[PDB]
Amino acid sequence: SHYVITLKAFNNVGEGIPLYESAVTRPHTVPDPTPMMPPVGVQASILSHDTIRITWADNSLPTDSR
Amino acid sequence: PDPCSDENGHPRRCIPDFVNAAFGKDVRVSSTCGRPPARYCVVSERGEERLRSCHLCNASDPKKAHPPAFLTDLNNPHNLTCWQSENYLQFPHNVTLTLSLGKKFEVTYVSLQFCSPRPESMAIYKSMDYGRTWVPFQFYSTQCRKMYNRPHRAPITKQNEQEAVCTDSHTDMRPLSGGLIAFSTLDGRPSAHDFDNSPVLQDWVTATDIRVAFSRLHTFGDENEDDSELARDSYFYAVSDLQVGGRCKCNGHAARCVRDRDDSLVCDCRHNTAGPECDRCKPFHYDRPWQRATAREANECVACNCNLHARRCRFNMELYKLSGRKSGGVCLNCRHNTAGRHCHYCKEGYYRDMGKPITHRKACKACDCHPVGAAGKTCNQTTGQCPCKDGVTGITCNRCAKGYQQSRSPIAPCIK
Amino acid sequence: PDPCSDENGHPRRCIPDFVNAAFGKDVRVSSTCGRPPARYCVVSERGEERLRSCHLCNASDPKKAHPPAFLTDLNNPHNLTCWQSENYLQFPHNVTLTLSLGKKFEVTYVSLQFCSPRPESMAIYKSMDYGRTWVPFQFYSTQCRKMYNRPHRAPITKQNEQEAVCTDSHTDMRPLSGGLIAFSTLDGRPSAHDFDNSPVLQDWVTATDIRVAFSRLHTFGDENEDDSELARDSYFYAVSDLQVGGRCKCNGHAARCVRDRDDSLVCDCRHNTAGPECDRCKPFHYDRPWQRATAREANECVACNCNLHARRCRFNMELYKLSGRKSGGVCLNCRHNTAGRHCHYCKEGYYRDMGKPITHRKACKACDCHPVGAAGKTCNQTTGQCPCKDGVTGITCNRCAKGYQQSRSPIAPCIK
Ligand SMILES: *[C@@H]1O[C@H](CO)[C@@H](O)[C@H](O)[C@H]1NC(C)=O
Ligand SMILES: *[C@@H]1O[C@H](CO)[C@@H](O)[C@H](O)[C@H]1NC(C)=O
Ligand SMILES: *[C@@H]1O[C@H](CO)[C@@H](O)[C@H](O)[C@H]1NC(C)=O
Ligand SMILES: *[C@@H]1O[C@H](CO)[C@@H](O)[C@H](O)[C@H]1NC(C)=O
Ligand SMILES: *[C@@H]1O[C@H](CO)[C@@H](O)[C@H](O)[C@H]1NC(C)=O
Ligand SMILES: *[C@@H]1O[C@H](CO)[C@@H](O)[C@H](O)[C@H]1NC(C)=O
Ligand SMILES: [Ca+2]
Ligand SMILES: [Ca+2]
């Protein structure tokens, strides 16, 4: 957020002439989620001139929407 | 001492201090009580009952008057001073307040502290030109549709952030005294977070004059009763404090705004720039296209280099494109027989002196090619040899070769 | 124009001008005639006879008054102005004069010009703090032993030059008017010749306040006679001129003392120093330990170098010792992923870009080592090669080698 700060000098008779200044507060840091393990055993199997089938495995797999 | 200079002395973004631009400035209003002197009544609510205290507004008496100067004067909570409009100026009739800054200001807020209850309908207007045309800034009403032809509680669209929005917020009759309406210019605007890179919102905050129009006032519905005088005298617009906060628009190239020779408020431009808002660039500094200053990059105006041979330089877009967005400043009318954007070169009928550099005044010696000896006037630039005809041995083609005798023919000057 | 700068602009020892620090300053005294107004008698000796002229001291009348302001005012031989103590304030009773400079001054002398005869017993006192504790400076008496518990005519010892000494010098009743007592702070002190290198005497000359106490006055012995009034009225302490000479203590780093924001006398420190007496060093200048300036060596405070990556630096004694008394400034909390007292370096999980120097922002590129391919995260700094497992050909260990196929095992990613 962008705040506007005002400073006044006051006594018993009242408040004096103000002095203005503005500042933008620094954004809160957000921790990044820890990453997952990438797939293993990635093998390319050439079938034709325009088709190649890719096969991979996952060590994390012992349900999920991954 | 200078804020524009870094610790080493490198250029950095310059911003003028945040100021209430309204303070001590003359405001033109449509109505003021006292001419002729009329009675006004203050309404006060306590519990379930309403109380009225009637006073007189006399423009001549300083303690009884409420002039427009009471809007812009110092706000003191101990001794409040407010301006007061003429009694019962209800819709269609309106009460307007025009404020002229006389310069482009990047407005952050427009606030109003009321002595009387806040209006049912109020609108904030701005002027890009110095008062010619008016563009709405913000609307406040119970019926945005019926009053100001705008949607009620409309969310800020990314498609048009340069549009004034209407809300029923801050319009409540309570508090009947001390009510505040403060308009945040960058409130709700989706790209406000990246303001420095958003020219759309940079233009939105810009205003030279501010006009606040009070269209409809809050009423209890007792004005149409048997006694109209007592009721209608207790409805009026009164404001104690008017604050237009924001910094002087200097596009990040000035730390302060100073009054010039014609008594006009202008930025004290830096980073080799000129203009009322530092929008353009100082003469002989057209080496780079003008760009507004950001937090990370100073965006200073780059000086031309003509090696003290030209007084005027021009910007070339094609050359700036060919340089890979580096430099595009080409010098105009190069003096001392020089050429190129660099402005150092030699000419025909002339040859370069190897003893002195190209930057020197006597860089090109005269090539005195004989009119009957030499074929052409243009010679060899590195050695200084004229194009001789009939194999003439002369440096400037002045002497016939061995065995050759001088001839009468202009085609054959030497004959073997 | 600046005395701190040399002809080329190199640093040199700065000394404030020699001033009478007492001049025009308020002095608090214990007694003054006129309240109530009393009679005083001036004694004058001519030949073998004594003569007395009695006058009146009236505090209200300007021509008859002798206020403490008459000590510090301009000394005029044509029109002398002296302060006068209350009549007959003989031992044990004393008359003291406290002078507050409000700053550390390197005192060269303390002088007193008397209107009445000089005292039989007088003492000069100084204050290191601003008046809390008092340390003796010099004693003057006929009986140093009996009066001030100090040896009479004691020679200045090399073992303790910071000790006040007592003498019977300058105590003589003659002259009965115009008698002078001037105390030389560095008189007789054995190491005074090498003052610049002697901190013991540098501390001795230092004082913030000066107090002179008149303990016993000279008498003829006629006060105890039949008529006490006439006799006792002719014995009093009177001083026309009080001079405290010396330069402002700025340890050779300032040419003048200026009053600050709180109206306090402070040195205008130079050579990258700060402090009331230039005793400490300006922030970010802790590259060398603080040292007082001498005639041959300027002894300037050396600036830290963090290559614009750190705002705060600290002094390390061990590093200063390891450098051979050259430099000992180590930068604190190095920014932009740098290390070292120099503050330029690279980190693990990262490698150096050879195209740009170490001082550049983008000096270290990210080392994106594959989590299943590479063995470790830390790579080769000069080439940018991750520690590959099973002979992986990839730069970041991303592709299997020739003949090798990708495997399910986390230990063996590629199998032949
Ligand atoms: C107050 O109003 C009356 C209206 O007739 C006017 O005559 C008078 O001058 C005003 N008071 C002062 C102090 O001017
Ligand atoms: C105090 O308020 C009254 C209100 O009428 C005004 O006339 C007066 O000038 C104010 N004084 C100051 C110093 O603001
Ligand atoms: C206010 O009244 C004036 C006429 O007095 C009119 O021109 C204007 O449109 C009205 N409305 C606003 C919002 O100013
Ligand atoms: C001198 O002293 C007397 C003491 O009674 C006093 O009344 C008088 O005012 C003094 N003289 C002057 C000029 O004040
Ligand atoms: C001259 O001396 C008398 C002594 O009482 C003093 O009152 C007066 O102020 C002196 N004048 C100057 C100019 O010093
Ligand atoms: C002077 O008298 C005071 C008391 O009035 C006493 O404190 C002090 O010790 C005496 N001696 C000196 C040298 O000040
Ligand atoms: Ca006010
Ligand atoms: Ca004097």
From Swiss-Prot, chains B, C:
Keywords: Apoptosis, Cytoplasm, Disease variant, Disulfide bond, Glycoprotein, Laminin EGF-like domain, Repeat, Secreted, Signal. Netrins control guidance of CNS commissural axons and peripheral motor axons. Its association with either DCC or some UNC5 receptors will lead to axon attraction or repulsion, respectively. Binding to UNC5C might cause dissociation of UNC5C from polymerized TUBB3 in microtubules and thereby lead to increased microtubule dynamics and axon repulsion. Involved in dorsal root ganglion axon projection towards the spinal cord. It also serves as a survival factor via its association with its receptors which prevent the initiation of apoptosis. Involved in tumorigenesis by regulating apoptosis. One of its GO terms (molecular function) is DNA-binding transcription factor activity, RNA polymerase II-specific. Transmembrane segments: none annotated. It is found in: Secreted; Cytoplasm. This is Netrin-1. One of its GO terms (cellular component) is glutamatergic synapse. Residues 248-303, 304-366, 367-416 form the Laminin EGF-like domain. The keyword Transmembrane does not apply. One of its GO terms (biological process) is positive regulation of cell motility. Residues 10-247 form the Laminin N-terminal domain. It is linked to Mirror movements 4: A disorder characterized by contralateral involuntary movements that mirror voluntary ones. While mirror movements are occasionally found in young children, persistence beyond the age of 10 is abnormal. Mirror movements occur more commonly in the upper extremities. MRMV4 inheritance is autosomal dominant.
